[PDB]
């Protein structure tokens, strides 16, 4: 599980909380269109 924190301009580069583990910015993947990301939601996110 994960927790969305903040969006970003142009290329996705969203910010993700785990639960308390780390608070950091990645682009996740590309198999879904980047319109399902809203703050207050939980994605299934890997560690690497």
């Amino acid at each position: 599980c994960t927790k969305i924190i903040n969006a970003d301009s142009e290329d996705p580069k969203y910010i993700i909380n785990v639960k308390q583990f780390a608070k950091f910015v990645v682009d996740l993947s590309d198999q879904v269109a980047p319109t399902d990301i809203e703050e207050g939601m939980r994605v299934g996110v890997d560690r690497n």
């Binding site: 927790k3 969305i4 924190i5 903040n6 580069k13 910010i15 583990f21 780390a22 608070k23 950091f24 910015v25 990645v26 682009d27 703050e39 207050g40 690497n48």
Partner: protein, 303 residues
């Protein structure tokens, strides 16, 4: 004309040599953005809070996983824009900063500003011309006619509270003034700043007012402040005190050190004597307005 011909030949040779050197330099830049992208395309960026800027030029950071760190080489980011207290992305393996994050605001703080922009108009309000008029001149005129205040020269009135019996109607005026302004509008629930993670409500207060500071044309409204505005008291072995911190930081950040005229607090309640005198003091909120009972014609207008 032998000297001129020799000068022309030297000019051509120097131009060719400069072209070759510029091509070699461009190839060097190609290897440069190659290495920069291969150290930059590691999209995992563990972020960190910068701590200090040493000189013996060097820097200190504190990461997300609670570890203090010192790095001699600052990295890709130039340090003149860097000041301590910020937060920046950091490579996982190298523990080097690479980019700069804009800000950091809480998700609950994010989910407060109006997205739907409710549609209401003044004709829905009956028998309340005076209150609506004085709210409009106390809010929109500081938003739209700044030079009108400045030409005479005064600070704008800061802080409005409306009160009255709950059936009286005031909320609707919040929706109407939301509909009328083309500015950023933030809304708070009453006890929304009540968390048992200690001082989390303080973080909520400072985060909300920092976001309010970010949008320079903006107004801040809180409904039902009597949850937090309950008067402080002296007692032993019992007594809530988290709401004391929340109310104190609320009052201070709206009025106290670093006074600011960019956001206007709008404050609703249904009773007044619960409210602590500190918030209603004189200038921590300015305009106290009562809702009268709909006397005889306002009822017909509303129905």
């Amino acid at each position: 004309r032998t000297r001129l011909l020799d000068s022309e030949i030297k000019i051509m040779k120097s131009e060719v040599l400069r072209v070759t050197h510029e091509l070699q330099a461009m190839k060097d830049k190609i290897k440069e953005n190659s290495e920069k992208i291969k150290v930059n395309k590691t999209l995992p960026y563990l972020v960190s809070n910068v701590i200090e800027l040493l000189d013996v030029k060097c820097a200190v950071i504190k990461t997300s996983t609670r570890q203090t760190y010192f790095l001699p080489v600052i990295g890709l980011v130039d340090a003149e824009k860097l000041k301590p207290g910020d937060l920046v992305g950091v490579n996982k393996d190298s523990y080097l900063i690479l980019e700069t994050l804009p800000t950091e605001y809480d998700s609950r703080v994010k989910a407060m500003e109006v997205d739907e922009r409710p549609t209401e108009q003044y004709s829905d309000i009956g028998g309340l011309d005076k209150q609506i008029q004085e709210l409009v001149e106390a809010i929109v005129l500081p938003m739209n006619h700044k030079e009108k205040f400045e030409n005479l020269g005064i600070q704008p009135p800061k802080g409005v509270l409306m009160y009255g019996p709950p059936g009286t109607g005031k909320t609707l005026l919040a929706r109407a003034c939301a509909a009328q302004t083309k500015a950023t509008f933030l809304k708070l629930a009453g006890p929304q700043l009540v968390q048992m993670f200690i001082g989390d409500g303080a973080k909520l207060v400072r985060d909300a007012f920092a976001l309010a500071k970010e949008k320079a044309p903006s107004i801040i409204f809180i409904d039902e402040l009597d949850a937090i505005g309950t008067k402080r008291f002296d007692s032993e072995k019992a007594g809530d005190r988290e709401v004391q911190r929340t109310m104190l930081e609320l009052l201070n950040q709206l009025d106290g050190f670093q006074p600011n005229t960019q956001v206007k607090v709008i404050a609703a309640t249904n009773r007044v004597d619960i409210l602590d005198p500190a918030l209603l003091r004189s200038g921590r909120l300015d305009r106290k307005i009562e809702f009268p009972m709909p006397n005889e014609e306002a009822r017909a207008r509303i129905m």
